[PDB]
């Protein structure tokens, strides 16, 4: 054989060289660094009003406004400071799995099992919120979506694909393929020039938004990936899985850097988020709790106990003042 | 301590709270039914017979039903079945016409879920005009050696029904409602109405401790 032999020998030799030139793990270089202690955080605000499981939640760029979507087919925009409900958008499909808040603050994006990314305009002259656009073309369910700008958004789907759209035209500018399983989460880089996405094929990968080419792929995993997020500098990313483990990869070494697992943890991770410093990795588990992990020591730095059902979504403000957590118990909680 | 504008914002928030409560009430009187089954199982037949994700809203005897069909999802990765908790029932469709083993494994899968241990299942064998003529070609042993009963309609159909019932691994919490009567007769929705009524009554009873 030549094509099969070529593929096998390539993969083997690249991976062997990567392993050989690997110097040390994340923990090996930070052993001298002192820990953070116990991250004891209190529920400062509790957002009541959602009457079903909360699936997605995204902070606004002002670090004061929130948007959350519930299984009840409702997208609530909250004023976290006072617990004032700013907006209540009735979604067209009640099966919504992702939320995004436009960096400018004029738009919000949502969607789910309807295979459509709906974009709603907040700053209208009529005093209400309307459906600005609907992006269609994905075949599998809508896993995640993130605004690049006021007119350019990036999406992941369960078709093993991602899509870069142009909101004005409504057509998908680029289609990113290469996954073999359902793509469950995407994170946008701070400079909005790349992104990373994990799929049900138990693999993650870095995709360039401009060239539409598959820049890199990362493996070393047992189960599917349900959550992914960038380090605040866009030089790494953490993934959460049904394996009951969270893994931190670097996009330059091309190798997994650190593992975030504990023996008593038996269920998967639903959501992943980073501290403003990237010093605390917050992970929502199926154990009805949210764990805070020392991103450099891999230890559990705390637990955001206080949710009576699965913690579905996490989020950290842009200023790092508070953490929003949404669970299946129909409550969002802000912790500080 | 509120400013003149914060008071109006709080009034708006309270109005939004009222709207959310009054729409959640409206959403809590509606019977949510998941629709499952293999291909060519009558799913398309049932959705038309019934009075990405495809939602069918229909009213029967004052009960408003939202039937959710997720057959369009081409990935069998069950990454969204947990989204269908709280649904009153799962309508699973099978055809008497080894695709039967495929239906059996699907039924075992749906029953085994930790997310559906409390939700009854409504299994249908709806059509009855093509379920008899093809039983004479050969007994129920082309891929099922174990059957040793009369190779007639009622005997073999009842045996298959009982064998699908047998996959219920814990009959203590949930129940199975089976259907046979021809699809031509307008009884398919009526049976669904009775099954959901029974499910809701038992849920109410199991809530006040009268279970």
């Amino acid at each position, epitope marked *: 054989d030549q094509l099969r032999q070529e593929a096998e020998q390539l993969k083997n030799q690249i991976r062997d060289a990567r392993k050989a030139c690997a110097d040390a793990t994340l923990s090996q270089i930070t052993n001298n660094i002192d820990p953070v202690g116990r991250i004891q955080m209190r529920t400062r605000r509790t957002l009541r009003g959602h009457l079903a499981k909360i699936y997605a939640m995204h902070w606004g760029t002002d670090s004061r406004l929130l948007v959350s979507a519930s299984q009840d087919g409702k997208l609530i925009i909250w004023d976290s400071y006072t617990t004032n409900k700013v907006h209540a958008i009735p979604l067209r499909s009640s099966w919504v799995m992702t939320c995004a808040y436009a960096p400018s603050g004029n738009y919000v994006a949502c969607g789910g099992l309807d295979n459509i990314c709906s974009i709603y305009n907040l700053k209208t*002259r009529e005093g209400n919120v309307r459906v600005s656009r609907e992006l269609a073309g994905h075949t599998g369910y809508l896993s995640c979506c993130r605004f690049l700008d006021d007119n350019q958004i990036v999406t992941s789907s369960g078709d093993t694909t991602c899509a870069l759209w142009d909101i004005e035209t409504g057509q998908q500018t680029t289609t990113f393929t290469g996954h073999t399983g359902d793509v469950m989460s995407l994170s946008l880089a701070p400079d909005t020039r790349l992104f990373v996405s994990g799929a049900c094929d138990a693999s993650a990968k870095l995709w360039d938004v401009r060239e539409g080419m598959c820049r890199q792929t990362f493996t070393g995993h047992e189960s599917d990936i349900n959550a992914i997020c960038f380090f605040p500098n866009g030089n790494a990313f953490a993934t959460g899985s049904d394996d009951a483990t969270c893994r931190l990869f670097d996009l330059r070494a091309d190798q997994e850097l650190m593992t975030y697992s504990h023996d008593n943890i038996i269920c998967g991770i639903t959501s992943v988020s980073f501290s403003k410093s990237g010093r605390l990795l917050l992970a929502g588990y199926d154990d009805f709790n949210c764990n805070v992990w020392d991103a450099l020591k891999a230890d559990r730095a705390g637990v955001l106990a206080g949710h009576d059902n699965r913690v579905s979504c996490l989020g950290v403000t842009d200023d790092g003042m508070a953490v929003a957590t949404g669970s299946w118990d129909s409550f969002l909680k802000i912790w500080n | 301590t509120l400013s003149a504008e*914060d008071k109006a914002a709080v009034e708006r928030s309270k109005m939004i709270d009222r709207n959310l409560r009054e729409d959640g009430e409206k959403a809590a009187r509606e019977v949510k039914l998941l629709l499952l089954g293999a291909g060519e199982s009558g799913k398309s037949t049932i959705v038309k017979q019934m009075k990405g994700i495809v939602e069918t809203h229909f009213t029967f005897k004052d009960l408003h039903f939202k039937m959710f069909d997720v057959g369009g999802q081409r990935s069998e990765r069950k990454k969204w079945i947990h989204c269908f908790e709280g649904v009153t029932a799962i309508i699973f469709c099978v055809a008497l016409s080894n695709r039967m083993h495929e239906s059996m494994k699907l039924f075992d899968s749906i029953c085994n879920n930790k997310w559906f241990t409390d939700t009854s299942i409504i299994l249908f064998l709806n059509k009855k005009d093509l379920f008899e003529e093809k039983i004479k070609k050969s007994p129920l042993t082309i891929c099922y050696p174990e059957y040793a009963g009369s190779n007639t309609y009622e005997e073999a159909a009842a045996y298959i029904q009982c064998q699908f019932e047998d996959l219920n691994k814990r009959k203590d919490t949930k129940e199975i409602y089976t259907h046979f009567t021809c699809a031509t007769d307008t009884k398919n929705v009526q049976f669904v109405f009775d099954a959901v009524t029974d499910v809701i009554i038992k849920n109410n009873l199991k809530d006040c401790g009268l279970f």
Partner: single-chain antibody
Amino acid sequence: VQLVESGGGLVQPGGSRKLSCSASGFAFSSFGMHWVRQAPEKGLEWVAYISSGSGTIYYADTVKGRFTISRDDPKNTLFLQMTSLRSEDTAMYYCVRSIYYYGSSPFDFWGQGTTLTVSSSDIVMTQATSSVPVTPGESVSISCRSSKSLLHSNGNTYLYWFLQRPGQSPQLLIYRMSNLASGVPDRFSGSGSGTAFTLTISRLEAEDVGVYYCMQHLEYPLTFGAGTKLEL
């Protein structure tokens, strides 16, 4: 957006009338409404307010207990029923929309007004001047002073800035502090601190002539200023 008033005319003292306001082009039910008035070449004066949902109705001390403000959300209509009309109730009355939520502009749109003629504690804000000559292209700086500190604990300094052009209804320019409204040229800017407040205009144009008004929203009743005129 369109707010058209009606019901004005000449009325003898001791009579009663009902000013009406028809709305078209926005989510009226989610908007509170203000009734304002301007006496002949004397200035703007707040009349009343009704919030979204009719849950809060406020009246001006000058006409508090005399007058009533009524909402009709299904018909998108506002009413001001005036019972006893003295010789001081002669003015052109404006219908204004106002929505309150984090970041909103609560006086974006004013109506065209309707005229009424009649036969023959509160924060005080003063406008330092009433007429200022200027030529196009020369920057201008209007200013006004207030009694208390409009800066609330929220960090919001609830001082507004409207401009009334010759022969047309007032137009919002700033809704808290330099926060330019929608559709206003970027040249207009606002600023101030506590009591002294200023409005700056760079590259003045021919459409910028008129009367500048500074109002406060920290506490009711709402109090306007005298009105600083710009000459050319």
